[PDB]
Design a protein around this ligand. Structure first.
Ligand SMILES: [Mg+2]
Lengths: 196, 196, 196
């Protein structure tokens, strides 16, 4: 479906931006920024692929995905190399990626089996997995532990995808509703200071 | 066998307690405590499943296992939310899990192949793997490095399972002897201050 | 081919030395030193095997590989237990391993598929993966982030293996040229202070 394909690109771009921003804040230079953005963008899909027995992983064979990760990370580096003082919305980029991958990752797991536990947990791991790798490599406690509603919101997003698909909702709509609920939940938590 | 099934539940409960305790000590709140307990309880089995080519992992498809991880972590949070000053035996919970999973993890590897190296190493990775993930997420040097006899004791436990099975020992007995040797070795190291 | 087999042993020895050195510097004792050397030596091959769908991993079934990792780590511990003040060339050992595994890891991926992205990225992950695990376990930002030209040099080494193989270069020669370019690139970066 077109929405599934689009969400893959949105998630790759968003997580690449979040990883490249993290590296910029850490003081890394161009190539180190590319490494962290590339890893954050593709890590969730790779981990998800391994859990589902899909080898080699799509992110390592389908050329547009790693090319998109590379270009997004490079664009982020160049942007903040010029505009050093403008805001760096790491959590906003991460949140958009969380919604794109909780939905598309739940979709991939649901195609493997109708098991609600597999769909909800693999979907959530797809969503958070790139940011977990980013935080581990950065040598800091990850968001899934420091942000009280973060991992659960990914779980909720993959669960609403499962429920929608279970009710025969068309795949394009089930993905959009899952993405929107995940993103909205994150915006409320961030804007209403639920995690403080 | 009944002992294999029982050891799976014992290991899941024990490692969930150890992960939830770690999160409580870190100052996390309810949902963060659940995340760390869930991850510690199921991580070793997932890693073991991937190494042996078993996908999707049993911990993500067999409902009682993640349900047990969730309930054990929730019980731990509620207990220490009320009884804030009572002792938190993280290492004791981890040690019981180490014995339950070194034995059952060696059993799973032995069913795949009679290779002593595969059985001993995959068994040890099953045993320590959940606590390694816990310590990495907590952003601290893991027990497998800070505790001089920890990883080796898991190796010894999986090796005694291999030897017992190689001698035709019934599976229920081979699991019990492996579990007991692992746990006893850990109790001696902790009580006799071997790791100081 | 003979060069592929030799490079496996060179990489295992080199990364075992680098991991055992890291543990010695961290103040670990004998068994902890063995754990970190063993993990660094075998982690890249295990990760590479999982990405390519090769289970159980060769490093866990082919006896000479983990035996070599163990003996190399033990030799490193004994050496620095006696000669406490002599230099500890962690980065030099890591660099030799990087060249041995970028080449041999690219070779393994190329046997699975002619996809330049798969060959270059899996090759680079094979090369850096053991040192990434070492640095994560040591609880420090890994070399792939702190050393500006490190990860890219592994990528270049696996890419020159791909180009050589694509041009019909004999496998023994393609491995040697890949190894030499990776190692030389690392020597220049270290000696010419490119990463400062
Ligand atoms: Mg860390």
């Amino acid at each position: 479906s077109i929405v599934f394909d689009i969400f893959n690109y949105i998630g790759i771009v968003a997580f690449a931006i979040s990883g490249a921003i993290k590296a910029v804040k850490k003081g890394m230079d161009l190539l180190g920024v590319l490494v962290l953005g590339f890893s954050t963008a593709l890590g969730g899909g790779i981990i998800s692929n391994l859990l589902l027995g899909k080898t080699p992983p799509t992110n390592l064979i389908y050329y547009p995905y790693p090319i998109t990760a590379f270009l997004a990370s490079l664009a982020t580096f160049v942007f903040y190399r010029i505009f050093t003082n403008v805001g760096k919305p790491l959590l906003y980029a991460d949140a958009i990626g969380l919604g794109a991958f909780a939905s598309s990752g739940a979709s991939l797991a649901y195609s493997v089996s109708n098991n609600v536990i597999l769909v909800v947990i693999v979907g959530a791991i797809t969503a958070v997995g790139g940011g977990v790798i980013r935080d581990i490599l950065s040598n800091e406690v990850p968001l899934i532990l420091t942000r009280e509603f973060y991992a659960t919101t990914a779980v909720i997003g993959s669960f609403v995808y499962f429920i929608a698909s279970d009710l025969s909702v068309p795949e394009d709509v089930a993905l959009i509703v899952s993405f929107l609920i995940t993103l909205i939940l994150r915006i409320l938590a961030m804007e209403l200071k639920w995690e403080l």
